[PDB]
């Protein structure tokens, strides 16, 4: 369990911990799920928290989050993210692949925005974003 990995999981935790108080509540999980277009019932929220809430106090602290995330062992989050973008797995993110992710995550797009995004990331000028370019941009 290296210090580098623990830091990456801390950053992930902070995307859920809306008040920064070090715990994830059902309300905070529900807020994130709704911003992604999902609408879990308050009972599904409680059951997701419960499967992770080792001490039974009803909220998820960082050690409990770390246990959940550790169990699955996947690759580093940044490699995981690249695979989401590069759906055909050839090691390059195309304009069509970037449009797909933007659409799936509910981000409005224009062709000129997408071209400028690739252009900013595209160090070698081949018209696509490879892994090295992706990591440097992110």
């Amino acid at each position: 369990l290296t210090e580098e990995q623990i830091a990456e999981f801390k950053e992930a935790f902070s995307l859920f911990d809306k008040d920064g108080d070090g715990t994830i509540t059902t309300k905070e999980l529900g807020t994130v799920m709704r911003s992604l277009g999902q609408n879990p019932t308050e009972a599904e929220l409680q059951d997701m928290i419960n499967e992770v809430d080792a001490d039974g106090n009803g909220t998820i602290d960082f050690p409990e989050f770390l246990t959940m995330m550790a169990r699955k062992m996947s690759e580093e989050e940044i490699r995981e993210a690249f695979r989401v973008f590069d759906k055909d797995g050839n090691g390059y993110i195309s304009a069509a692949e970037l449009r797909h992710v933007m659409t799936n995550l509910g981000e409005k797009l224009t062709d000129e925005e997408v071209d400028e995004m690739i252009r900013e990331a595209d160090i070698d000028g081949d018209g696509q974003v490879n892994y090295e370019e992706f990591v440097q941009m992110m």
């Binding site: 859920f16 911003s35 499967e51 699955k72 995550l105 981000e107 995004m117 992110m138």
Partner: peptide, 24 residues
């Protein structure tokens, strides 16, 4: 400058992947 859009997507993708973990 479009780095903010890339970073917004990365943040949303990470939240989505953690939610998937909670669903499992």
């Amino acid at each position: 400058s479009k780095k903010a859009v890339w970073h917004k997507l990365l943040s949303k993708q990470r939240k989505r992947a953690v939610v998937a973990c909670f669903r499992m």
